[PDB]
Amino acid sequence: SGCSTVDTVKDFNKDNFFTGSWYITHYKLGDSTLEVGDKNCTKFLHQKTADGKIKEVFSNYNPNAKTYSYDISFAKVSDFDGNNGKYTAKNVIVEKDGRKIDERTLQVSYIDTDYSKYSVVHVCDPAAPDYYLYAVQSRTENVKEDVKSKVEAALGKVGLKLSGLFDATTLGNKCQYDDETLQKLLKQSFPNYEK
């Protein structure tokens, strides 16, 4: 019980992964049937800087409530497990302006990625294992048709199929992403979490 350990991408290229932005297209969150409050449109921006810091800023938009939530993962190259796509991050839930609301530790496991199109991840809180997430992620709002099977294989490894996940792209026509806040918080200094 607790957080599941999943095999991860071998030879993780941080520099090509932690650049630009990603969209979360499909996902499973916990064991229970998904409620409308957990049906969100998520986009995140990240960056790895020379100092070795990794930073990821999430915009989570719930079309049903027309509300945004924001969180930021902070990590350092030295939090990664060797050369695998695996690491621990301090994830902070924040307001638009970056004020801390709550914080937790996440274990992030990249099951697979080709860097330029898609990634498949497992995220889990070692202190709240009932909060686990398997997610499909894309450089575009939809996963590009020509990698749909390369993705479905990855999900295969973890006992899942794409159709077995919430398709966030059913929200699409109502999906919104707070690019302004994303850009602003990425640049913004967080001395309580940097280092």
Side-chain angles (χ1 to χ4, degrees):
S1 301
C3 289
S4 297
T5 61
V6 310
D7 289 42
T8 52
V9 171
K10 203 199 56 163
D11 300 294
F12 197 55
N13 192 325
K14 307 194 194 75
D15 299 283
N16 295 124
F17 191 85
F18 296 109
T19 196
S21 69
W22 295 92
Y23 297 86
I24 300 180
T25 56
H26 307 73
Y27 63 86
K28 174 179 178 187
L29 177 74
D31 289 321
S32 273
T33 189
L34 205 62
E35 290 170 8
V36 67
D38 300 323
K39 296 185 172 179
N40 298 289
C41 306
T42 290
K43 177 175 184 187
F44 55 111
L45 276 184
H46 45 210
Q47 65 168 22
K48 181 175 89 70
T49 41
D51 59 5
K53 287 177 183 151
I54 284 75
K55 183 171 174 179
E56 330 191 53
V57 180
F58 300 79
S59 172
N60 310 307
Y61 177 78
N62 186 276
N64 179 74
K66 288 196 183 69
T67 45
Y68 282 98
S69 71
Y70 309 97
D71 63 280
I72 311 179
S73 287
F74 302 88
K76 296 176 66 166
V77 185
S78 65
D79 285 327
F80 282 66
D81 177 38
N83 201 23
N84 302 304
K86 181 178 172 53
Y87 65 107
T88 311
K90 164 56 110 292
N91 179 264
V92 183
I93 297 175
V94 298
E95 323 255 38
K96 260 186 65 174
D97 73 341
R99 246 175 312 146
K100 173 268 201 177
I101 296 182
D102 201 344
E103 58 190 80
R104 73 211 143 160
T105 305
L106 302 176
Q107 309 178 355
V108 186
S109 306
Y110 278 95
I111 296 147
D112 186 42
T113 190
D114 68 6
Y115 300 94
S116 53
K117 293 186 178 181
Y118 78 89
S119 50
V120 178
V121 76
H122 168 261
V123 181
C124 189
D125 186 343
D130 288 352
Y131 171 82
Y132 72 88
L133 168 73
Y134 284 102
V136 177
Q137 310 181 141
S138 177
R139 295 301 202 175
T140 48
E141 299 186 25
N142 309 266
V143 358
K144 196 178 183 299
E145 199 284 336
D146 60 35
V147 294
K148 294 213 71 69
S149 78
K150 205 165 306 182
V151 159
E152 197 128 23
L155 295 170
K157 170 202 132 44
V158 292
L160 293 172
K161 285 187 292 294
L162 194 55
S163 54
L165 301 187
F166 170 69
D167 182 351
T169 78
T170 54
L171 296 170
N173 32 326
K174 298 189 181 180
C175 280
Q176 293 287 327
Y177 308 98
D178 196 348
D179 296 294
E180 173 186 289
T181 303
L182 285 176
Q183 280 147 26
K184 179 195 69 174
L185 296 177
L186 185 76
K187 291 183 260 295
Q188 184 165 313
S189 168
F190 293 78
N192 301 342
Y193 306 113
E194 303 160 357
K195 300 173 302 296

